[PDB]
Structure formats: structure tokens, C-alpha cells
Amino acid sequence: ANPCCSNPCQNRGECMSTGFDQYKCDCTRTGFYGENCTTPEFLTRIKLLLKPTPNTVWYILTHFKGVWNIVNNIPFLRSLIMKYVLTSRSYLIDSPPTYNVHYGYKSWEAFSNLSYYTRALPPVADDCPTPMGVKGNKELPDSKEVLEKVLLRREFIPDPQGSNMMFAFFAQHFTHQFFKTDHKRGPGFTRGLGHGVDLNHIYGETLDRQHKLRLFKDGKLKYQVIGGEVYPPTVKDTQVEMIYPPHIPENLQFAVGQEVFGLVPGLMMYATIWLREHNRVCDILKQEHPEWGDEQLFQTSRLILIGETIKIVIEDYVQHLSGYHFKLKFDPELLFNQQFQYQNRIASEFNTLYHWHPLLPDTFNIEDQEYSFKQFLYNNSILLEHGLTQFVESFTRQIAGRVAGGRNVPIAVQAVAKASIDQSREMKYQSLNEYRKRFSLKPYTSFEELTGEKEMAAELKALYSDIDVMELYPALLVEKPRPDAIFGETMVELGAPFSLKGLMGNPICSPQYWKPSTFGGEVGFKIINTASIQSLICNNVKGCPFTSFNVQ
Amino acid sequence: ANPCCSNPCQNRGECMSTGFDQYKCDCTRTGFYGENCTTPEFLTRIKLLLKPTPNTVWYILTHFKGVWNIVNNIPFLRSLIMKYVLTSRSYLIDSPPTYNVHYGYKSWEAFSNLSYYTRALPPVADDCPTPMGVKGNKELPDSKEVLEKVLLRREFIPDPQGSNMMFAFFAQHFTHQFFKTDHKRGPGFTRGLGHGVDLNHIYGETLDRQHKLRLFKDGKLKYQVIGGEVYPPTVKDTQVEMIYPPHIPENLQFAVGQEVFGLVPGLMMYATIWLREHNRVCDILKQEHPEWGDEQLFQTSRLILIGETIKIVIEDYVQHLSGYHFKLKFDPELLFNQQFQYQNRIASEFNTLYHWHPLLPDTFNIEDQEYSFKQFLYNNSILLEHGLTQFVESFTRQIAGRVAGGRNVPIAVQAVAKASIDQSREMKYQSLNEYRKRFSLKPYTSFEELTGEKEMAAELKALYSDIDVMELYPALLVEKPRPDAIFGETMVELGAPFSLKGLMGNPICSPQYWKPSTFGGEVGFKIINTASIQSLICNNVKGCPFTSFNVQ
Ligand SMILES: *[C@@H]1O[C@H](CO)[C@@H](O[C@@H]2O[C@H](CO)[C@@H](O)[C@H](O)[C@H]2NC(C)=O)[C@H](O)[C@H]1NC(C)=O
Ligand SMILES: *[C@@H]1O[C@H](CO)[C@@H](O[C@@H]2O[C@H](CO)[C@@H](O)[C@H](O)[C@H]2NC(C)=O)[C@H](O)[C@H]1NC(C)=O
Ligand SMILES: CCCCCCCCO[C@@H]1O[C@H](CO)[C@@H](O)[C@H](O)[C@H]1O
Numbered sequence A, B: 001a002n003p004c005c006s007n008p009c010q011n012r013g014e015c016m017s018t019g020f021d022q023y024k025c026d027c028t029r030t031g032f033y034g035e036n037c038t039t040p041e042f043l044t045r046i047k048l049l050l051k052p053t054p055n056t057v058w059y060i061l062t063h064f065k066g067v068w069n070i071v072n073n074i075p076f077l078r079s080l081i082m083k084y085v086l087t088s089r090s091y092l093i094d095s096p097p098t099y100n101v102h103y104g105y106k107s108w109e110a111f112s113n114l115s116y117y118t119r120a121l122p123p124v125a126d127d128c129p130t131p132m133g134v135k136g137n138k139e140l141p142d143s144k145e146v147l148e149k150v151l152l153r154r155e156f157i158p159d160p161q162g163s164n165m166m167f168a169f170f171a172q173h174f175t176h177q178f179f180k181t182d183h184k185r186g187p188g189f190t191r192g193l194g195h196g197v198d199l200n201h202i203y204g205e206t207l208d209r210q211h212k213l214r215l216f217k218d219g220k221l222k223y224q225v226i227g228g229e230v231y232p233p234t235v236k237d238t239q240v241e242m243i244y245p246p247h248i249p250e251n252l253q254f255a256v257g258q259e260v261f262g263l264v265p266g267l268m269m270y271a272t273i274w275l276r277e278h279n280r281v282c283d284i285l286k287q288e289h290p291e292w293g294d295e296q297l298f299q300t301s302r303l304i305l306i307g308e309t310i311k312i313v314i315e316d317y318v319q320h321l322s323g324y325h326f327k328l329k330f331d332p333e334l335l336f337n338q339q340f341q342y343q344n345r346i347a348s349e350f351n352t353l354y355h356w357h358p359l360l361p362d363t364f365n366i367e368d369q370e371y372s373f374k375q376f377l378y379n380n381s382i383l384l385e386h387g388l389t390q391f392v393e394s395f396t397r398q399i400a401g402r403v404a405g406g407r408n409v410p411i412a413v414q415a416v417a418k419a420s421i422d423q424s425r426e427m428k429y430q431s432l433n434e435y436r437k438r439f440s441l442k443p444y445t446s447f448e449e450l451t452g453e454k455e456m457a458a459e460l461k462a463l464y465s466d467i468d469v470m471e472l473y474p475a476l477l478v479e480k481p482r483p484d485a486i487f488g489e490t491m492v493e494l495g496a497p498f499s500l501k502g503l504m505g506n507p508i509c510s511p512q513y514w515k516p517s518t519f520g521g522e523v524g525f526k527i528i529n530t531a532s533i534q535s536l537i538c539n540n541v542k543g544c545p546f547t548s549f550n551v552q
């Protein structure tokens, strides 16, 4: 019934009903006008014929290694490039946020209520004839069918970019501070009221949880010593709630910021690393400031670790999966003369695209042993023995799965992968081609153009019938990968704007915060600005083992 | 004890202890360097010699009624001027926010915890030898003494700027939506988690309260008809929490968004007027959108009313107290090519300076009658007896009291005045001159320069002893007023930045929100862009009585 169900407004113009069967497009500040915001203005037609495709820009970024070697060694040139990639990725994101799962129009409820994941595209209205608006059948194809035919793993397909388990667990650990779905309320709801990098997965979301985790001495986090090694404290000791099956012994019920980090030893490994890092920074800050009390030591350390995180995420993590020869750089100052909002709201689609299930291996290989999922889940005794030591060394060695390309979702987590599809439909996501348009990408004209092959393309065409009906999440895992890349075009071009917004939108990146006294002076500032995944491990893991997000 | 107790860093530089008896100033981006950030750079002294005193600018704005008459009638010129007053006032505010009552250093707790008022200047550390840091005696002068000698009203001093009771009650009504002090936690905390103009004083702070105030038909708020007039619903009907003395009859316990608006008929006057305006906009939207449902009518009306409020506050309210001949303008588009953060955190000092108790008259004059405080408080039967039209007419006529100039706080609210002083101290406010320096004002060299006279100055000198120990709140009420103005220099130069940040920081002012379709189309958009306190009253008060913020 809703006349806006067909999504008739193009180029990010907004649709509004004006009658029971009539609509209007608001073309304000789109660069276009006309009934559907499709006829371009003069300056717009100039930009459109000058803006290179994302695949072209990707090509330039991933080739000419010698040229980028010169550029990377020229500070003013490097900063200039990093500035551009920052600003253009940012303008793609609505900030302050607009829609959520219950509001396909701007409202104060949608803006103010921090319990919602925001939304990059409004939901399809409930009174639309089809799930995607007006196209397709009354029901989307059977999600079991999609899952089994084009997503499930026959045999392991390794990432050609060489991502390892250090990367995969880092991705899970890091993003689980802002992907905290409130399952009581629904998939479109979050428990992460910070909506970004606040390290609540280390420090707890609430003050009460934080204080239970605190030592209240020298700014430090509580911990225990097992075999001369430092590990998180137990549930019995701190009384903080953790999720654990009942058969788990008390001495292994480790207590950390995120309640669910006890379920994967890979998570607990990073939880331990960061706990050691915080207490390390406390020691440094106490050395510099003997006059400081516990509270200032703790807070400043936390601000420093927030900095380290953002540093490591941009210059190691995002650097690795980008495949760029250009050396990405964390430098807040690059935005000081730019128009930029120091705020973020985490989008539901950013949650959805991050369901990187095919990253997981068939078995978790730690030195001699090869563990199954059942052996690996809720099992921290694995962590203890092999250690922080062998865990880093082993996870650095083991290859991870390719995400795009199709048919690489491990069978164990098929329930989780089906859930991703079903919840996307529950939240009334628009089609793949809609999101591609929302992010300045050309819509696919066939399933073959999407997959880059024929077998899976034919399978999808039988299921969905029309390419404009194809859903975002399955397309992300079945999309044609870039040449020897882990990802297709859609994943990168959606993920990068969301990610950099989250990273740079942090208050510590704002001019009033980005100065040495915020971090206890030059020494604390230095810890931020020289952070790396390697130094993170080196300072806190015994023996300083080598590490990387890629297989050696 | 603390080496930063004497506030050694000048020009917004940040002090940090580097030992038990050593400090360091972070002079980053201040334009100054050196130990205390006092020796300027080249561009600094240029600007310093080019930037005129606030009194110079105030003089130019409040003179040449004939020249401004031309400027105002030239759209591009007015826009250009308004842009300048907007950008410059805004840059004075820290955004994202920094300190609060418990944190004299940047911390994630201070940033993320919305229950705090923020603070333009950090508190004086608890271990400092004197209340203001280093200067003065161990004890501030007796607040009762300060109160009775330079604050209490002898005889009513009328505002020479002509502010009426429509102004005073609007000021109390409008600001109580973001000055919602949570006295259970302390004076440094707030219940207004939206930290701005969200109209929670009409719609309720929480969702369940909003729903109790809602009719769930045509987007409208619940109401009742008494005589033949529309009034807010009862507590009995809506079951919402209001604050009433136990002797107030059930048919007079009106239910509104703000729980305390039932205690002052002037507040209930505005609550009624805005309730009518919401339901009126619902009728307009429903006419334009017969296809819309209750929820979208409510949300869109709330967005429009948020717009009307900001429009009126800038072009009528702030316009009136500025005294400017230049016609201020509400136009979000002015900031679209400017660096500006669409966010805001209510500052404690903004709350403090906004306690304009001397605005209150000796009696409340409504047509025939003249009511004392005891008769006026809690007495909505007065509002029913006289009606909205008589209220508006009477309050438009009645002059309000002068705020600066000293000795004009009525004896009834002397308890409130003392709490202002007392709570500023509890919250460890820095001295008046520290706040003047914070806001680019020259520090007062003597009590005589502060007051502009001799008697009060002498009393103040015997009480505080040193001018650099003078407190902010009494200084504001005692400060020498501008010629025929309601305020002195400090009130205006502190108040304008906080105010315009709150007004323009609102998300509806952002380019993503500021378009017709946000407000249900061109018709809804016109309601915002043509709003005035006059039109508000004319549309919603029987007979369309004349109104203004100044005595006719
Ligand atoms: C944000 O919105 C959600 C969804 O409307 C609110 O959660 C509802 O709260 C009411 C209480 O008034 C309950 O009756 C509902 O069952 C809740 N629904 C869900 C899905 O949880 C939530 O209260 C809102 N948050 C704020 C701060 O207003
Ligand atoms: C914001 O800060 C206040 C002040 O610390 C927090 O309130 C305290 O909460 C603890 C429990 O965690 C109580 O024991 C204290 O009595 C509270 N103090 C006051 C003054 O209320 C509050 O929890 C914080 N809010 C959030 C959302 O973190
Ligand atoms: C040419 C090498 C430096 C260019 C760095 C560009 C970084 C990514 O830039 C992206 O390009 C996309 C395609 O044009 C656009 O869709 C995005 O808006 C933009 O963020």
C-alpha cells in the first residue's frame, strides 16, 4: 500500500508519501533533481565522469609497489593520501544517525534511543507486498536452501591474502565490544551503548562490573598467577557474571569485560593479552607519576589502550585486509582542518557484513594437537597449557578461510550462518542492489556478474529468480573476490566507511583530546603512536614471539 | 598539595602534575608556548590586536538602528553576519566534552557517563589549600552574608531592557528541559540525558512516560476540556508521576512532560500552550498525510515543535536579551560549510549562570488581582479562573526584575539563591576571574571595576578580600550592567556560547535532518521557518492576544 515500497528515490534522496498511493522525493543536497532524483545537476555530471570506480581505485592501490614505496617514505605525501581516504569514506555515513529497525523515517525516538543499532538504509515497510518492497515473490527463497547450496563448506578454501587465526580471533575480539546484540529485545538492538571503541570488552559496560574487575591499586585490573603466568581473575573471586556451561570448574571460569569471551580460548587469549597490557601501562604511568592515585592511573591507561587499539586496527588490521601497498596511518590531526563529526552510531548492516563465518578453520591447530569445535569451545585448559606462548605461535601459523567466493562456511556454525540470513529478513533489510546504490556502487545485472562464475550463479537464479531480489548477507559471502583477495567489492566498499567512522569518530581523536596531557604526557602519547600487533604481543607475551595477521 | 592548584596554565593550556611538586603545561594548539603558555606566536598577537573587546562589539550591535535596518533587509549580508556570530560563539565550547565535577582530567568515565553535567573548567582539586586553589583564606565568606549584603532585594529594580513575565516564564519553562538536576546524586548531576532541546518537558524523559501522555490517535497528546478550553490531562487519567503538595485536589493535578511544572501557573501556562501547538500540528500533518498513522504523526510533530522552539529561542528570546539592532536568524544552512559538531553536553556553569532569580517580581499581576508567592505557587486554579488569554495579556504587561546590578533577589527565593552559592562551592567551582579568562575576558582588577559602584564593592572587599577569590555566581548578579541592559559582560559572554551550542548542536540542524521531508514536507517545514512567540500564542490562545518578551 505504501507508495514508497518500490524505493523510487535514487541517489540518496528521501521518499515520502503524499497520499494513499502517491509519493514525493526530497532531492535536497543530493546533486540531483526531478521526480526520482535521477536527472543530475551540472557539477554532478562532472564529478560522475571523473570519479573512478572502486575496482579501479583498488587496482591502483594494490599495484605499483615501487611507487608506493616512494610515497610511503614521503610524510607530506603519505598524510595527503591518508587524508583523502579518510574524508571520502566518512561522507558515506549519516552522522548524526537516522533510521533503525522500527523507523523508516527520521524521528527523535530513532535518534535518541541508544538501544537500537542505527541503519544505513531504512527498513522495508511492513505493508509492502514483497519482502524487498515490490519485487520478487511473497516469500524469499528458503534460507536452508541458500545456506546449503551456495554457502556451506565442502572443502576448506584458504584465504589467498594469507589471513591467520591471530587475525580471525582479533576480528572477533575487537568487534565484540561494539557488536553486542540484545537478544532479549531483538536483532536490531545492542547492549553496547558506547556504540564504538570504548574497550568495554576489557573493562565492562557498567561501572559496577568495572569496579569488580578493578584492583583499586595503582590503576590496575585484578588478575591471578598460574604457573608463573598472569591470567584474568575467576568468577568466584570477583563475582562478575560470565557465560559458562555448568560443567566448567571454578578455577577455569575466567572473568573479563565481555561476558561471552570465556567460550573461545582464542578470545580469552586476547582478553589476557590486553589485561596484561593495561597493567603494563599502569606500571609505566606510575613510574612517570608517583603522585597519581589509583583512579587517574586506571582512567589514563584505559585512554591509552583505546589509542593503541585504534592504532593497531588501522595500521595492522585494516592494513592487512586492504591489500594496499600504501601504508595506512592513524593520525587524528589529518581531520582537524576537515568537516568531520566526532561521533558514531553502529549500524545493523555493519554488524551483518561482519558475520565472517568462513574465516573459521575446520580444526584449531595448536602445536601438536588439532582440536574440533566441541573440544575447543568453553575450554580454557587448552589456553593454559599450550599457553599464551604457543597460542600466539600456533595461531600465527594457521591459515584462515576465504570470506567471499562462496561455499566456505564451516558446517559447525551452519545454524549461526542461517540465523544471519533469517535475522536480516526479520529486520526487513533491503536488497543487495539497494545497498550497492546506497554506497555508490553499480547494481549487479545478473547472478553471474555477482559470483563471477556459473554454477553458484545458476543455483542462486533458481532460488531468487531476480537479481534485484538478492539479499545482502548471502551475496557478501558468495560474491566474486577481487584478484587473490579475501573480499569482494561490496564487502570493502560498505565495511570501510563504517569502520573508519567508528575509529576516527572516537573522542580521543578530537582536537581537545588529541594531546599528550590526555594520556599522562609524552610517554603515554608515545605508547599510542608506536603501537602494533607485534609490540602488543612482544611486551606482554613471554619470549616475544613473532606475530602477524598473515601467514609467514 | 597538587602542583596544579594555582591554575598556572594560561590560555586554555592544560596543567598536569609531573611529580609531588612539579607541573607541566600542555600548550598544544593554544597559540602560546612557554612554561605557562603565555608567550604568543605571530598570528596570535595579530588576532589579539585585531579582535575588539566584547564591549566594543556589543556597542556596535546595540547602536546604529538605521544602519542595521538596511543590513537586516539584505538577506546575504544578514546571513553573512549571523554566520560569524554563530561560528565564533560555538568555538568557545569543548565538543566532545571533557571535565565534570569528579574529573579534573580527561577520562572515559567523564566523557561517556551522561548523568553528569560537563564543565567548562575543571573542579579545584580536593587537596588544594584554599577553595579557589591557592589564593584567599581557608574558607570562602559566609554565603548568608554574601546573600544578605549584595544579593537580597531592597526595593524592586525593574529591568531597563523591558523584559516581561512572558519572558521570565518562558525562560523557566524552556531551560527546565535541560536543567533537570538530579538532587539524589548531587548538584553536579542531571536527569536530562538528552542534554539539550528535545522537548522532554512536554513529551516526557522516558518512553513509558511519553506513552502515558499520548492519546495514540492522530499523533496527539491527551487533553481535557475545562469550561471550553483545552488543558493538560490529569494524573488520575494518565497515571504519570507529578510533584504536588498533598492538599492539591485530583482535578488540579495536571500531568505534563516535566514533573515539576505543576507548581507554577506560569509554567502550566506554557505547558498548555505547547500541548495545544503539538495537537494543532497533528491536525495540519493529518490533513497533508491522510495515509499516515498515529506514531508518525506524533514523531513528525515532535520534530517540528523542536524546530519551532529553536527558531523562537533564537529570533525572539535571545534576540530580546541581546539588545541587538541586528536581527538574529535561525538558519542551520549557515553552518553547512563550517566545522561544527552536531552534539552537546550541558555544562554545570551554564546551569549556574542561568539562575536568574532577580527576574522574579514582588507580586504576580493578573488583570484585577495581584498575587503573592504563597498564593501563586501550586495554584493552578488561578490559571483556570483567569484563563490563558488573560494570563498572556497580564504577563505581557508586567515588567520583570533586573538580573545584574546587585541586590535584586526577592526574599522568598533567598533559599534558592543561597543554594546556588553553596552548591557552586560543593562542586568546587574556580574563581570568577578564572572563568573570565576561560572565555577570553580581561580579569577584573578590583571589586569596584566588577560592580561599577562603591557600596557593594566595599562590602564584597571586606568579605572576599581578594578580587581573584570572587565567586562566579554572586559576581554575575552583582556585576555592573551594560548601559540600560539586564546583564553585565560576563553573563553574555559565558551564556551565548553555551546557548548557541545547545540550539545549533541539535541533530535537526544537521544537513541530513534539515530538509522538508524530515518534517512531513514543505508545509511542516514552513511551520518551523515561520515560528515566533507571537504566532505561537496567536494560534493557540483564544482571541489571538498580542505578545512579546518586552513590555509593550
Ligand atoms: C528504546 O526502544 C525500545 C523499543 O521500543 C524500548 O524497549 C521497550 O520498553 C518498553 C518500556 O516502556 C517495554 O514495554 C517494551 O517491551 C520494550 N521493547 C523492547 C523490544 O525491548 C526501550 O525502552 C527504549 N529505550 C529508551 C531509553 O527509551
Ligand atoms: C555515572 O557516575 C555516577 C557517579 O559515580 C554513578 O553513580 C554511582 O553508581 C555506583 C554504583 O555503580 C553507586 O554505588 C554510587 O552511589 C553512585 N553515585 C552516585 C552519585 O549516584 C553512575 O552509576 C554512573 N552512570 C553510568 C551509566 O555509568
Ligand atoms: C588513487 C589512489 C588514492 C585514492 C584513495 C581512495 C580510497 C578509497 O576511496 C573510495 O573510493 C571509492 C571509489 O571511488 C568511493 O566510492 C568512496 O567514496 C571512496 O571513499
Ligand SMILES: CCCCCCCCO[C@@H]1O[C@H](CO)[C@@H](O)[C@H](O)[C@H]1O
Pocket (backbone or CB within 6 Å): B051, B052, B053, B054, B055, B057, B060, B061, B081, B084, B085, B088, B089, B440, B493
Ligand atoms: C560587528 C558586528 C558583527 C559582529 C557580530 C559579533 C557577535 C558577537 O561576537 C562575539 O564577539 C565576542 C567579542 O569579541 C567574542 O568573544 C566572541 O567570540 C564572538 O562570538
Ligand SMILES: CCCCCCCCO[C@@H]1O[C@H](CO)[C@@H](O)[C@H](O)[C@H]1O
Pocket (backbone or CB within 6 Å): B148, B149, B152, B153, B154, B455, B456, B459
Ligand atoms: C530588605 C533588605 C533585606 C536584606 C538586607 C539585610 C542585610 C543588611 O546589609 C546591609 O544593608 C544595607 C542597606 O541596604 C547596606 O547599606 C549595607 O551595605 C549592607 O551591608
Ligand SMILES: *[C@@H]1O[C@H](CO)[C@@H](O)[C@H](O)[C@H]1NC(C)=O
Pocket (backbone or CB within 6 Å): A006, A007, A008, A035, A036, A038
Ligand atoms: C520514478 O520511479 C518509479 C518507480 O521506480 C517509476 O514508476 C516512475 O516511472 C519513475 N519516474 C521517472 C520520471 O523516472
Ligand SMILES: *[C@@H]1O[C@H](CO)[C@@H](O)[C@H](O)[C@H]1NC(C)=O
Pocket (backbone or CB within 6 Å): A374, A375, A376, A379, A381, A382, A385
Ligand atoms: C579441553 O582440552 C583438553 C586439553 O587441554 C582436553 O583434554 C579435553 O578433552 C577438552 N575438553 C573437552 C570437553 O573436550
Ligand SMILES: *[C@@H]1O[C@H](CO)[C@@H](O)[C@H](O)[C@H]1NC(C)=O
Pocket (backbone or CB within 6 Å): B006, B007, B008, B009, B035, B036, B038
Ligand atoms: C607560571 O605560573 C606560576 C603560577 O601562576 C608562577 O608562580 C610562575 O612564576 C609562572 N612562570 C612563568 C615563567 O611565568
Ligand SMILES: *[C@@H]1O[C@H](CO)[C@@H](O)[C@H](O)[C@H]1NC(C)=O
Pocket (backbone or CB within 6 Å): B374, B375, B376, B379, B381, B382, B385
Ligand atoms: C488560589 O487562587 C484562588 C483564586 O483563583 C484563591 O481563591 C485561593 O485562595 C488560592 N489558594 C491559595 C492556597 O492561595
